[PDB]
Design a protein around this ligand. Structure first.
Ligand SMILES: Nc1ncnc2c1ncn2[C@@H]1O[C@H](COP(=O)(O)OP(=O)(O)OP(=O)(O)O)[C@@H](O)[C@H]1O
Ligand SMILES: Nc1nc2c(c(=O)[nH]1)N=C(CNc1ccc(S(=O)(=O)Nc3nccs3)cc1)CN2
Ligand SMILES: Nc1nc2c(c(=O)[nH]1)N=C(CNc1ccc(S(=O)(=O)Nc3nccs3)cc1)CN2
Ligand SMILES: Nc1nc2c(c(=O)[nH]1)N=C(CO)CN2
Ligand SMILES: [Ca+2]
Ligand SMILES: [Ca+2]
Ligand SMILES: [Mg+2]
Ligand SMILES: [Mg+2]
Ligand SMILES: [Mg+2]
Lengths: 540, 543
């Protein structure tokens, strides 16, 4: 009706899905999608992990402004989103609702019609100023077209149960949904659009049949229960998992891999133990850029730069000299800054000197540091670490109700907040903070129970810490320097077998040597040749 | 007249069970039993592992030893230390082949079963009518010159009396015989006559034995009923089938393990532990990765003994000494002789292993009490006479058996294997079989795959990937500083390949820890120790 161009200010919960098939640019593709789902729709307030199941560089400088103000203001809750998960009282739908049974038979048909005839998933939740799914779909297919590669779909829209059959509308009607939401200053797009929306389906039809979706939704909205679906998202997912194992004898989680992004590239969760080189500037900036290189060639994937004589005077020129002498000359080290200072990180990010924030307070010193993790086109990854106190009070701040789980819950909550504020889940790393307000037997216990982080990207730092020495039994300070490095290599081995994603180390060459040998031992050609060869010997 | 004393010189196969409760003295007690077996009864041609075993009373639910050794009477039968490579009588025993009739009356199966089953319930009642301490069990096969089971039991009881519970020795089988003799009364001068047939006798030991031999069962009443018995026999004679038994030993042992899981949710394995012996004491198989510190001696003895002490303090449990212009003997013996003196100027003592294939060198070390273990890289194929030096009258010595092909010059060429992992394992098994046939206790034998010895780098890698193949065996490996380590790395030259090899070795130390390798042989004792300490701490979940 005319109710579509209703000017009354409204807010809706817009759960989406963002697809691609290109492996090499899935990050550069889907983050570009998000920036425009953030520009032209509302606010991203949830993301799932990324899963496996040059034109764009120029476009971003010339974009059509939105008729809505962009808000980098941090929030700590969302009332509308909280209403959505519970499915309480919200406004009546703009477009006509088919009932529970009417939707079910219409769902079965569109499946069977297409049944007769790697995928890179990432779901979102958008706090949206859009009025209705079809108004959103018009903006979506317009976004799709400006990206020239991508399939953005609507998965829910509040608790709405809408199926709309035949849809075609005029070349000015489409423009009169684009005028409502976007400044328009070119027309080739509308031509492809007109019949590229044939239908509307809320919820999406594939939702409970495709695995790539029930896996993304399990991350974001596990307890959510639509009137359409037979159970909660968790329970439909956990049935699909045991169903594939029982019926077809397939571990489905084996081919559908969780991804985390450090900088530019895909990274498969639990599939590598990256070395992170410690560069501690505490002074001659020549010697330090020399050391960065020494560490790259020794095998470090990441360099963790930290100066905590001003902090920015210790870190920024050292990073500046690095960036000059690098271009002096796909092997480029990822750079993380060990700072809690907003001004230092801002300067580093605005001069493109860093890729990761390593925040040892888990962004609780200055929550506003979260803002800086996203420019107009770039996102940045973050290490969130657990601690209590400072270096002077730490050692005494040691009582926990439940050590392992309090720290885990702490970090999960911290993530939840970053996520609510549109930091993409797959860019958040967990760090238990070994030796930071932990006794030695407590640091060990955290390692004992490291499996607790099997679903998450894990960054840890054991190197040279006092707890290593506590493990050892019985020139005085020189022997203990040797034992500390060697004791560290034990923890690298442990980390390797526990599939820890990143380890933060001083002794890069030694750790690389250890990881190389362990990797070789695991590099088995024929996975069932041990039993084959066993059987051959028994038949003499 | 007794045809039990008949002068007809016979060769019988006997299977014995040995038991003690003394944890600390288990090795000394059981090996003393082994000597007296070897001395008074025949030739030891098989042994099981040593086991720490849970007591099975209910089925269906100090210094004098050494002084005794100085004061033994001569056997009337000779000791022959010559190497054997086969034994016919034993092959006949295992097959159940044609053997002379029993001098003692045999019962049939149904009678045996009735009588054996009877004895069990009686004993079962007396025990429920009634005790914590573990048993230390071992089985042995003796090619015996004793005429019959009853005469054998008489001699066994003499052995048990000489030793002065401390020791129990049972006969499990004697040839293919089935025997159940109730109410045995042997006259005290019959006992004397039997003992005097086999031993040059030189007081109320004989009087004590009169009421000690109450009955005779062959097979032993508890053969099928005690886990600890079947556990030991599974090691020696897994496919043996006595007429009175439902199946082979392996099947019987296996059924028992499975029945314990189904009918009881017991893992019968967890509390019945396999033991190996490096020198003196019990080690539990797979419970500790021991460090073996390398000393290459190849005008140096003082600096070498210094290094010995550096290694002990750095945490080595074992020192492996090797000297392979100047002779091997001259390199190693002074160093060992000096170590022994310095140590005597002061159970914190390291075990001493000598890396040698030379009879002459080993003979001198053993004579002068300088070593505990033979590390033989040829797996005693170079001079099998060296096996004779592993047994004294009272001492047994442990031995590392290593796989190699050729010599250091032809070695890197002899590299073709049909089934690498299993060829090597079978080779080591056969070498163990020969030593075991020749009287070396199974629990003193250590397996070593010989990394880098006639293996291309990938082959040394494949061997480590497949180390699980030795989960049943005492395992010794030496990876330290070998070329195959560097073959793993993705990229001064003098002190950088050096660093990487040391650092790569520590990765294998880690892998070895998780694979529960029993002994690792390393150059870098302190570095290796720090790894193992840390990995041990992470594992200590204890409260
Ligand atoms: N094959 C056999 N081996 C040893 N003893 C036997 C055998 N058959 C019968 N016996 C009798 O059983 C008696 C058991 O005495 P002994 O103290 O040696 O063992 P036990 O502890 O009583 O029981 P077990 O024979 O179950 O170990 C022996 O003195 C002997 O007379
Ligand atoms: N993400 C991340 N970033 C880090 C980390 C870390 O673990 N994770 N650790 C340090 C180093 N901090 C540290 C150093 C020594 C000890 S300690 O074990 O030696 N104990 C001390 N207690 C008091 C003062 S130092 C503890 C922590 C610096 N930055
Ligand atoms: N039980 C036992 N005893 C041993 C062992 C062993 O593995 N097990 N190894 C050596 C040392 N021999 C050896 C050394 C090096 C290589 S190598 O292939 O790696 N070559 C080189 N090593 C260093 C420089 S070049 C091979 C064998 C001596 N004694
Ligand atoms: N495990 C084990 N248990 C026993 C043994 C023995 O040798 N081993 N001997 C017994 C009576 O001689 C009673 N119980
Ligand atoms: Ca927005
Ligand atoms: Ca003999
Ligand atoms: Mg679509
Ligand atoms: Mg017994
Ligand atoms: Mg007995």
């Amino acid at each position: 009706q005319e109710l579509i161009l209703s000017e009354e200010n409204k807010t809706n919960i817009a759960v989406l899905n963002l697809g691609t098939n290109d492996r090499r640019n899935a990050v550069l593709i889907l983050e570009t999608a998000l920036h425009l789902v953030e520009k032209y729709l509302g606010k991203i307030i949830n993301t799932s992990y990324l899963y496996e199941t040059n034109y764009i560089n120029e476009l971003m400088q010339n974009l059509e402004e939105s008729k809505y103000e962009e808000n980098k203001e941090l929030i700590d809750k969302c009332e509308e989103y909280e209403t959505f998960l519970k499915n309480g009282k919200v406004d009546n739908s703009i477009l006509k609702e088919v009932n529970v049974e009417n939707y079910l038979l219409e769902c079965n048909n569109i499946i069977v019609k297409n049944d007769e005839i790697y995928f890179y998933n990432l779901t979102v939740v958008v706090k949206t100023f859009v009025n209705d799914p079809l108004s959103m779909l018009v903006v979506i297919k317009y976004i799709e077209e400006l990206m020239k590669i991508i399939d953005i779909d609507i998965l829910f829209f509040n608790d709405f149960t809408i199926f709309m059959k035949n849809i075609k509308l005029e070349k000015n009607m489409i423009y009169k949904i684009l005028s409502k939401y976007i400044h328009l200053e070119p027309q080739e797009i509308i031509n492809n659009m007109v019949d590229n929306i044939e239908f509307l389906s809320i919820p999406h039809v594939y939702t409970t049949h495709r695995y790539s979706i029930l896996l993304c939704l399990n991350d974001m909205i596990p307890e959510y229960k639509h009137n359409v679906l037979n159970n909660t998202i968790r329970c439909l997912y956990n049935k699909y998992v045991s169903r594939m194992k029982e019926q077809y004898n397939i571990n489905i989680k084996e081919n559908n891999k969780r991804i985390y992004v450090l900088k530019d590239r895909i990274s498969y969760l639990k599939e590598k133990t990256n070395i992170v080189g410690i560069l501690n500037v505490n002074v001659e900036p020549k010697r330090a850029v020399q050391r960065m290189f020494e560490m790259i060639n020794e095998g470090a994937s990441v360099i963790d730069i930290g100066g905590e004589i001003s902090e920015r005077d210790l870190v920024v020129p050292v990073l500046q000299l690095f960036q000059k002498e690098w271009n002096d000359i796909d092997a480029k080290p990822i750079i993380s800054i060990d700072t809690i200072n907003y001004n230092v990180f801002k300067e580093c990010v605005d001069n493109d000197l860093v890729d990761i924030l390593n925040d040892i307070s888990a962004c609780t010193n200055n929550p506003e540091i979260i803002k800086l993790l996203k420019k107009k086109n770039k996102f940045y990854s973050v290490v969130l670490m657990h601690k209590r106190g400072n270096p002077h009070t730490m050692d005494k701040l040691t009582n926990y109700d439940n050590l392992v789980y309090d720290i885990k819950n702490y970090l999960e909550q911290r993530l939840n907040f970053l996520v609510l504020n549109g930091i993409p889940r797959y860019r958040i790393l967990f760090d238990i903070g070994l030796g930071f307000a932990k006794k030695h037997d407590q640091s060990i216990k955290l390692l004992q129970n490291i499996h607790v982080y099997d679903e998450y990207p894990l960054f840890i730092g054991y190197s040279r810490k006092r707890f290593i020495a506590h493990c050892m039994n019985d020139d005085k300070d020189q022997l203990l320097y040797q034992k500390n490095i060697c004791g560290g290599l034990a923890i690298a081995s442990y980390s390797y077998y526990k599939k820890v994603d990143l380890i933060r180390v001083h002794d890069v060459l030694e750790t690389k040597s250890v990881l190389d040998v362990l990797t070789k031992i695991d590099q088995v050609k024929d996975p069932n040749s041990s039993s084959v060869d066993k059987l051959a010997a028994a038949l003499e």
